Each structure stands twice: as C-alpha cells, then as structure tokens.
Amino acid sequence: HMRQPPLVTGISPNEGIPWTKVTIRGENLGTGPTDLIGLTICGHNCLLTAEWMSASKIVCRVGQAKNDKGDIIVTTKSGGKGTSTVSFKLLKPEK
C-alpha cells in the first residue's frame, strides 16, 4: 500500500560530458511537476534544467561529477530521494 520510492534503471545513452542530454527512465518518478521539488545528478543540482514529463520520463542534463558513481537521485513530495541501480559515466569536456 505504501508508495514505493522512485526507482531508476534506464538510460538512452551511456557515455558523455555532463552537458550531454539524457532521458531518465524508471518507475514512480513523481506523478506531477510540482512533486519533483528536488532533483540532483552526480550530487550536482540540476532542477532548473530538469523538466517533468511523466511518472518515469524526465528530461535533464547530468550534473557535473561530485560523488564517485553517478547515481540519478530524484526527490518526490509523495515519497523521497529516488534510488538508481544504473549510473551515467561522465566524460571530460571536449576541447
């Protein structure tokens, strides 16, 4: 009965700089734009860029690395921080 925390386990790409676009895929990633109050990628905050789409898909650019794995966390008012088994590998800026 209790609402399960947003689960993440899907990604179109699998390698690219932080500014690289990546489509989030999972389950119960908040059933509303307002619900998605908190958003962070690689520890770096990126809510401003993050855009709500559905209870699974979320468009947002991966934030600069800070942690050491690349866990896609997603906060939700109904629930809390989303856990992700998968992690995006951040590539050094092209220059």
Curated annotation (Swiss-Prot):
Q: What does this protein do?
A: Component of the exocyst complex involved in the docking of exocytic vesicles with fusion sites on the plasma membrane.
Q: Report which part of the complete sequence is shown.
A: 5 to 97 of 924
Q: Which cysteines are joined by disulfide bonds?
A: none
Q: What does the annotation say about its assembly with partners?
A: The exocyst complex is composed of EXOC1, EXOC2, EXOC3, EXOC4, EXOC5, EXOC6, EXOC7 and EXOC8. Interacts with EXOC3L1. Interacts with GNEFR/DELGEF; this interaction occurs only in the presence of magnesium or manganese and is stimulated by dCTP or GTP. Interacts with RALA and RALB. Interacts with ARL13B; regulates ARL13B localization to the cilium membrane.
Gene giving rise to this polypeptide: Exoc2
Q: What is known of its domains?
A: Interacts with RALA through the TIG domain.
Record-stated family: Belongs to the SEC5 family.
Boundaries of every IPT/TIG domain copy: 6-91
Report the subcellular localization: Midbody, Midbody ring
Q: What is this protein called?
A: Exocyst complex component 2
Organism name: Mus musculus
